[PDB]
Design an enzyme around this catalytic site. Structure first.
Site, PDB file in Angstrom:
ATOM      1  N   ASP A  62       0.800  -1.178   0.045  1.00  0.00           N
ATOM      2  CA  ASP A  62       0.100   0.076  -0.033  1.00  0.00           C
ATOM      3  C   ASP A  62       0.944   1.101  -0.059  1.00  0.00           C
ATOM      4  O   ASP A  62       1.249   1.759   1.062  1.00  0.00           O
ATOM      5  CB  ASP A  62      -0.902   0.210   1.135  1.00  0.00           C
ATOM      6  CG  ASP A  62      -1.826   1.038   1.209  1.00  0.00           C
ATOM      7  OD1 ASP A  62      -2.178   1.850   0.253  1.00  0.00           O
ATOM      8  OD2 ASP A  62      -2.490   1.500   2.413  1.00  0.00           O
TER       9      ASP A  62
ATOM     10  N   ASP B  28      -1.266   5.123  -5.697  1.00  0.00           N
ATOM     11  CA  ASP B  28      -1.847   4.564  -4.766  1.00  0.00           C
ATOM     12  C   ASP B  28      -2.104   3.083  -5.046  1.00  0.00           C
ATOM     13  O   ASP B  28      -3.189   2.697  -5.524  1.00  0.00           O
ATOM     14  CB  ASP B  28      -3.027   5.170  -3.933  1.00  0.00           C
ATOM     15  CG  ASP B  28      -3.518   4.396  -2.747  1.00  0.00           C
ATOM     16  OD1 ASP B  28      -2.793   3.454  -2.319  1.00  0.00           O
ATOM     17  OD2 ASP B  28      -4.493   4.908  -2.335  1.00  0.00           O
TER      18      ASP B  28
HETATM   19  C1  LIG Z   1      -9.272   4.048   2.564  1.00  0.00           C
HETATM   20  C2  LIG Z   1      -8.217   3.055   1.908  1.00  0.00           C
HETATM   21  S1  LIG Z   1      -7.145   3.712   0.604  1.00  0.00           S
HETATM   22  C3  LIG Z   1      -5.414   3.013   0.997  1.00  0.00           C
HETATM   23  N1  LIG Z   1      -4.535   3.269  -0.170  1.00  0.00           N
HETATM   24  N2  LIG Z   1      -5.156   1.933   1.780  1.00  0.00           N
HETATM   25  C4  LIG Z   1      -6.063   1.916   2.950  1.00  0.00           C
HETATM   26  C5  LIG Z   1      -5.357   1.397   4.251  1.00  0.00           C
HETATM   27  C6  LIG Z   1      -6.957   0.148   2.621  1.00  0.00           C
HETATM   28  C7  LIG Z   1      -6.650  -0.079   1.345  1.00  0.00           C
HETATM   29  C8  LIG Z   1      -7.415  -1.426   0.919  1.00  0.00           C
HETATM   30  N3  LIG Z   1      -7.044  -1.627  -0.462  1.00  0.00           N
HETATM   31  C9  LIG Z   1      -7.681  -2.884  -1.033  1.00  0.00           C
HETATM   32  O1  LIG Z   1      -8.478  -3.693  -0.736  1.00  0.00           O
HETATM   33  C10 LIG Z   1      -7.274  -2.840  -2.609  1.00  0.00           C
HETATM   34  C11 LIG Z   1      -8.086  -3.757  -3.623  1.00  0.00           C
HETATM   35  C12 LIG Z   1      -7.610  -4.076  -4.738  1.00  0.00           C
HETATM   36  C13 LIG Z   1      -6.577  -2.998  -5.368  1.00  0.00           C
HETATM   37  C14 LIG Z   1      -6.101  -2.332  -4.330  1.00  0.00           C
HETATM   38  N4  LIG Z   1      -6.211  -2.155  -3.085  1.00  0.00           N
HETATM   39  O2  LIG Z   1      -6.379  -3.079  -6.610  1.00  0.00           O
HETATM   40  C15 LIG Z   1      -6.650  -4.275  -7.389  1.00  0.00           C
HETATM   41  C16 LIG Z   1      -8.034  -4.410  -7.051  1.00  0.00           C
HETATM   42  O3  LIG Z   1      -8.294  -4.824  -5.788  1.00  0.00           O
HETATM   43  C17 LIG Z   1      -8.408  -1.958   1.953  1.00  0.00           C
HETATM   44  C18 LIG Z   1      -8.372  -1.471   3.206  1.00  0.00           C
HETATM   45  C19 LIG Z   1      -7.745  -0.162   3.510  1.00  0.00           C
HETATM   46  F1  LIG Z   1      -7.768   0.207   4.845  1.00  0.00           F
HETATM   47  C20 LIG Z   1      -7.343   2.933   3.408  1.00  0.00           C
HETATM   48  F2  LIG Z   1      -6.504   4.077   3.510  1.00  0.00           F
END
Ligand SMILES: C[C@H]1SC(N)=N[C@](C)(c2cc(NC(=O)c3cc4c(cn3)OCCO4)ccc2F)[C@H]1F
Length: 379
Positions: free
Chosen positions: A37, A222
Site C-alpha cells: 500500500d 496508490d
Molecule cells: C481508504 C483506504 S485507501 C489505501 N490506499 N489504503 C487503506 C489502508 C486500505 C486499502 C485497501 N485496499 C484494497 O483492498 C485494494 C483492493 C484492490 C486493489 C488495491 N487495493 O487493486 C486491485 C483490485 O483490488 C483495503 C483496506 C484499507 F484500509 C485505506 F486507507
C-alpha cells in the site's frame, strides 16, 4: 542493481482484493500475507482471531517483541481499525536478505477493514512519516529498512492483474519487468506519493480544463486503491467525453456512476468501442512533460463473483473523488512504477505484464512541451 530474480513474482492476490507480499514478524518468524500500500504509512497487522483472518500476529510467541505502551485509532472514510503499538523483527522472505526492527500496529479491533474471503492479514504502508498514525514520529517500515540496512532508498512495483500477480522489487529496478524507457515525474511533497497532472486526454482529445482541477486537492499514486479516482469536476468532463467516444453502444447512466454492472457474452467484450485515457505528468525538466496512456482493459474491470448472472460482467472503475486524483490499480496495472525516494521522483514505463489487445497497448511517451506546470499544483 538491474536484476533481482528472487523478488520477481513475489506478489499475489485475487481480483478486487489487492496485491500482497509474504512477510515474517517476530522470533521465531511468523508468516503473514501483507497488502502492498503506497497510499498509507503504517505497518499494521491483525493480532486477534477475527473470523475473516487466515492467521494473525501472536505477540506472546515472539522473544524480540517490544511494547511501545501506546494505542492508535485509525478511522477511514468507510472503515476503521484500532491497535497497540510495538516493535519487532521483520523480514521479507522473497525480498532482500535482511532483518529490520520495525514499528508494528497490532490490530485488536476493526470494522470494514479485513475483507471476508481475502488472503491477507495486514497492510504495509509504504508512504512517508507525515501521514503515519498517530503522528510523524512513528517511523514507517521502509524508513526503518533504509536506516538499518544497505538497501537503497527505492522500490518498484509491477502489478499485473486479470487471481493476480506481480513484483515488488525492494531496493532496485528489474529491467525485465518493463519495455521502452522509464519516464520520471517529481514527488511534489513527501507525504503521500504526490504528483502533478498537467493535461488529460480521452482518445487524444484534450479535456481543456484548468489543470489545477486535475490536482484538486492533490494527485497521488496508490497501490492500495482499485480505481482511477478523479476530482468531481474532472470526472464529469471525462465521463461526458468517454460517453461520446463510446457512442456506438448505449449504456445506462448508473453504469458510468458505478451504481450497476454491465455484462456481455463471454469472449465478446467490445474493447474497441471504448477510448484510451491519457494523463500528462510533470516532467523532470522545466516546460517538459510526458504522457501515460491506459486502455479499457485497465478501467473496465471484471467482476467474477456475480451469482445472479451467467455472463461476463464489468465494473466501470473510474470514479468521482473528494480527495483529489487517485492513480490506483487502474493506472498501475498498465505500468512498471519506480518509487525513487532517493531522488524524490516516480518512474513510469510500459509494463511487460499489462493486459492489452492486438490493436492497442498501454504507453509511456515523451517529451512534450507543457507550460505553467507549477500552476497545476493546488495550494
Ligand atoms: C481508504 C483506504 S485507501 C489505501 N490506499 N489504503 C487503506 C489502508 C486500505 C486499502 C485497501 N485496499 C484494497 O483492498 C485494494 C483492493 C484492490 C486493489 C488495491 N487495493 O487493486 C486491485 C483490485 O483490488 C483495503 C483496506 C484499507 F484500509 C485505506 F486507507
Amino acid at each position: 542493481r538491474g536484476s533481482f530474480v528472487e523478488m520477481v513474482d513475489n506478489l499475489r492476490g485475487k481480483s478486487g482484493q489487492g496485491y500482497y507480499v509474504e512477510m515474517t514478524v517476530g522470533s521465531p518468524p511468523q508468516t503473514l500475507n501483507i497488502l502492498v500500500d503506497t497510499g498509507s504509512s503504517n505497518f499494521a497487522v491483525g493480532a486477534a482471531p477475527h473470523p475473516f483472518l487466515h492467521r494473525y500476529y501472536q505477540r506472546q510467541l515472539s522473544s524480540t517483541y517490544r511494547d511501545l505502551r501506546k494505542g492508535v485509532y485509525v478511522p477511514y472514510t468507510q472503515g476503521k481499525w484500532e491497535g497497540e503499538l510495538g516493535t519487532d523483527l521483520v523480514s521479507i522472505p522473497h525480498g532482500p536478505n535482511v532483518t529490520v526492527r520495525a514499528n508494528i500496529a497490532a490490530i485488536t479491533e476493526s470494522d470494514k477493514f479485513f475483507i471476508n474471503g481475502s488472503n491477507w492479514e495486514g497492510i504495509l504502508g509504504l508512504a512517508y512519516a507525515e501521514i503515519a498514525r498517530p503522528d510523524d514520529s512513528l517511523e514507517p517500515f521502509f524508513d526503518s529498512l533504509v536506516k538499518q540496512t544497505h538497501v537503497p532508498n527505492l522500490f518498484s512495483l509491477q502489478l499485473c492483474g486479470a487471481s493476480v500477480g506481480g513484483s515488488m522489487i525492494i531496493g532496485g529496478i528489474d529491467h525485465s519487468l518493463y519495455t521502452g524507457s522509464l519516464w520520471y515525474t517529481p514527488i511534489r511533497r513527501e507525504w503521500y506519493y504526490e504528483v502533478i497532472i498537467v493535461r488529460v486526454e480521452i482518445n487524444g482529445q484534450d479535456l481543456k480544463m484548468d489543470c489545477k482541477e486535475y490536482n484538486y486537492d492533490k494527485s497521488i499514486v496508490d497501490s492500495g486503491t482499485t480505481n482511477l479516482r478523479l476530482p468531481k469536476k474532472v470526472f464529469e468532463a471525462a465521463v461526458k467525453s468517454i460517453k461520446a467516444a463510446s457512442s456506438t453502444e448505449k449504456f445506462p447512466d448508473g453504469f458510468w456512476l458505478g451504481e450497476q454492472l454491465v455484462c456481455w457474452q463471454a469472449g465478446t467484450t467490445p474493447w474497441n468501442i471504448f477510448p484510451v485515457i491519457s494523463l500528462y505528468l510533470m516532467g523532470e525538466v522545466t516546460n517538459q512533460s510526458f504522457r501515460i496512456t491506459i486502455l479499457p482493459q485497465q478501467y473496465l474491470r471484471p467482476v467474477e463473483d456475480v451469482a445472479t448472472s451467467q455472463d461476463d460482467c464489468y465494473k466501470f472503475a473510474i470514479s468521482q473523488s473528494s480527495t483529489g486524483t487517485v492513480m490506483g490499480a487502474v493506472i498501475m496495472e498498465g505500468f512498471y512504477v519506480v518509487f525513487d525516494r532517493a531522488r524524490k521522483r516516480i518512474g513510469f514505463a510500459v509494463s511487460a505484464c499489462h493486459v492489452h489487445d492486438e490493436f492497442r497497448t498501454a504507453a509511456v511517451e515523451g517529451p512534450f512541451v507543457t507550460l505553467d506546470m507549477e500552476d497545476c499544483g493546488y495550494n
